[PDB]
């Protein structure tokens, strides 16, 4: 079974977005008004699932082929790749990275999305993989289009891909969103701006990565992820 042998650097909750960020309107009623209660790390918090033996399908990481209904999806072919490390710079190998997104037109394949831009019959918008033994992941996909949404009267998400990362424990688990280098919608978005520190926002912007592109085929973006630093216990109960 799992053991309590490590501690995770405490989160900076002014680096993360705060709960109440009223320009993102849905946060107003979905933010706790009482303070979080701090608790010490125990085996409950410092362990978590390892997904080494989850069974992945051949195309689970390849959104150009994993919703194949007779053709390729329309839109900008891209690789999205990066490394997962902790705050001490240590790679996080064999960790679960899940992602989801809209199609090239900003339309999601979910019944609740009634945006008039059409669905793509060959695009589903869901991927997963494990990081390799050196902490690297890679997906192939279509660059998603900006998505309008009912926040302010003319609000549009920048092009974005949702990411979920498990890491070594439930204390490291994170959901975040990737944005794309240069997107002029980034500075305007109330969800991006839930993050108060502009340097933190920059950490979510994937960079064009020509080095990793396939010529005459697909471009590439690089998105590195940093999870909470993990250290050994020291001088406890003594």
């Amino acid at each position: 079974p799992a053991q309590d042998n490590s501690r995770f650097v405490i989160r900076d909750r002014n680096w993360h977005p705060k709960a109440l960020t009223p320009d993102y309107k849905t946060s107003i009623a979905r933010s706790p008004r009482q303070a979080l209660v701090s608790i010490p790390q125990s085996i409950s918090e410092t362990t978590g699932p390892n997904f080494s033996h989850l069974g992945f399908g051949a195309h689970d990481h390849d959104l150009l082929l994993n919703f194949n209904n007779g053709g390729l999806p329309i839109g900008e072919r891209i690789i999205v790749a990066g490394r997962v490390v902790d705050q001490y710079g240590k790679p996080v190998p064999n960790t679960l990275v899940e992602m989801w997104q809209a199609n090239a037109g900003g339309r999601y394949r979910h019944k609740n999305d009634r945006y008039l831009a059409p669905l793509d019959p060959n695009f589903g918008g869901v991927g997963r993989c494990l990081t390799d033994s050196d902490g690297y992941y890679s997906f192939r996909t279509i660059k998603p289009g900006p998505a309008p949404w009912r926040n302010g009267p003319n609000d549009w998400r920048p092009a974005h891909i949702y990411f979920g990362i498990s890491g070594p424990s439930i204390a490291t688990k994170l959901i975040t969103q990737l944005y794309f280098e240069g997107d002029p919608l980034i500075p305007m978005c109330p969800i991006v701006k839930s993050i108060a520190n502009p340097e933190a926002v920059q950490q979510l912007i994937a960079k064009l990565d020509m080095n990793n592109a396939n010529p005459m085929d697909c471009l590439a973006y690089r998105f590195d992820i940093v999870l909470r630093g993990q250290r050994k216990t020291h001088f406890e109960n003594c």
Partner: protein, 200 residues
């Protein structure tokens, strides 16, 4: 002072979280293996229980797009991290509230007692992380059991909640659903009866 690499900042899981993380709940086709809400197969040791609940916002209205992740000890108080769909028990699972099904469910066993880092027993609990549209960073809570009053009163984690009336927000209510043992654990994100949320 020493400043490490900053952690990647959280963002909301958004209204379409189920397409990535709860495919069946999204009404979309599933892959061969999915991480879902059955932690225990019938053969797992321990007391088989159904957990269920609803999630409310600050206006008392149902949250119909929640996504929950859970992490619990097996009936012997051991965390099982080797996730495999072949296992009779997994310590990890996922569930969701949707427009069609506003009440999430989990099929599991009652967790055994686990000691904290100082060696003090914690009352049986399930660790929960709550994600949704409107939630910028997930909310951590614990589900405890109303039939463990003695253990609950002595739990070193419950006792870090300064007010006794807030401890009550973490105690699930035992019931019976179709002749089977169940507990209801409703979460109130904001306002009256606001559920205790943790930082660690």
């Amino acid at each position: 002072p020493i400043e490490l690499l900053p952690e990647t900042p959280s963002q909301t899981a958004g209204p379409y979280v189920h397409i990535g993380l709860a495919l069946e709940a999204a009404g979309n086709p599933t892959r061969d293996q999915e991480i879902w809400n059955r932690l225990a197969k019938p053969d797992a040791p321990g007391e088989h229980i159904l957990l269920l609940g609803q999630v409310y916002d600050g206006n008392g209205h149902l949250v119909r797009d929640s996504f929950l992740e859970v992490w619990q000890a097996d009936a012997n108080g051991e965390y099982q991290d080797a996730y495999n769909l072949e296992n009779a028990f997994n310590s990890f699972g996922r569930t969701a509230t949707t427009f069609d099904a506003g009440e999430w469910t989990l099929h599991t066993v009652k967790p055994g007692v686990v000691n904290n880092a100082a060696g003090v027993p914690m009352a049986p609990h399930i660790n929960i992380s709550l994600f949704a549209r409107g939630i910028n960073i997930h909310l951590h809570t614990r589900l405890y059991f109303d039939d463990e009053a003695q253990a609950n009163a002595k739990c070193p984690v419950l006792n870090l909640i300064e007010q006794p009336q807030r401890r009550e927000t973490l105690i699930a209510k035992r019931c019976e659903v179709d002749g089977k043992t169940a507990y209801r654990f409703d979460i109130r994100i904001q306002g009256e009866g606001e559920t205790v949320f943790f930082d660690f």
